[PDB]
Design a protein around this motif. Structure first.
Motif, mmCIF file in Angstrom:
data_model
loop_
_atom_site.group_PDB
_atom_site.id
_atom_site.type_symbol
_atom_site.label_atom_id
_atom_site.label_comp_id
_atom_site.label_asym_id
_atom_site.label_seq_id
_atom_site.Cartn_x
_atom_site.Cartn_y
_atom_site.Cartn_z
ATOM 1 N N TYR A 61 34.869 25.401 48.963
ATOM 2 C CA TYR A 61 34.606 24.370 49.953
ATOM 3 C C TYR A 61 33.100 24.259 50.182
ATOM 4 C CZ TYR A 61 34.205 22.156 54.529
ATOM 5 O OH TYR A 61 33.825 21.352 55.585
ATOM 6 N N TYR B 77 30.435 23.035 52.936
ATOM 7 C CA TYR B 77 30.065 22.559 54.254
ATOM 8 C C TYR B 77 28.814 21.702 54.096
ATOM 9 C CZ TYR B 77 28.697 21.900 58.996
ATOM 10 O OH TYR B 77 28.382 21.268 60.180
ATOM 11 N N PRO C 262 37.343 25.744 56.722
ATOM 12 C CA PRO C 262 38.573 25.020 57.058
ATOM 13 C C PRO C 262 39.646 25.101 55.982
ATOM 14 C CG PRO C 262 36.831 23.479 56.492
ATOM 15 C CD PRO C 262 36.193 24.843 56.575
ATOM 16 N N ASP D 125 32.337 18.753 60.437
ATOM 17 C CA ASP D 125 33.732 19.174 60.273
ATOM 18 C C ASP D 125 34.460 18.662 61.516
ATOM 19 O OD1 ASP D 125 36.089 20.513 59.436
ATOM 20 O OD2 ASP D 125 35.371 22.471 60.140
#
Ligand SMILES: [Fe+3]
Length: 54
Positions: free
Chosen positions: A11, A13, A40, A19
């Protein structure tokens, strides 16, 4: 702004995206994320992220 990768799941960010489904508005720097924010996707803690830059 900067991008940070989760070293567990991949993932990314993206500070420009934030987010927002997890309470983080766009333009929030990684250093400004709450201490208990986690990836997440996989749940990894902040310690497992690396900034994408040399
Ligand atoms: Fe992850």
């Amino acid at each position: 702004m900067a991008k940070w990768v989760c070293k567990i799941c991949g993932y990314i960010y993206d500070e420009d995206a934030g987010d927002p489904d997890n309470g983080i508005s766009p333009g929030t720097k990684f250093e400004e994320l709450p201490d208990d924010w986690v990836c997440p996707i996989c749940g990894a803690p902040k310690s497992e992220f690396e900034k994408l830059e040399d």
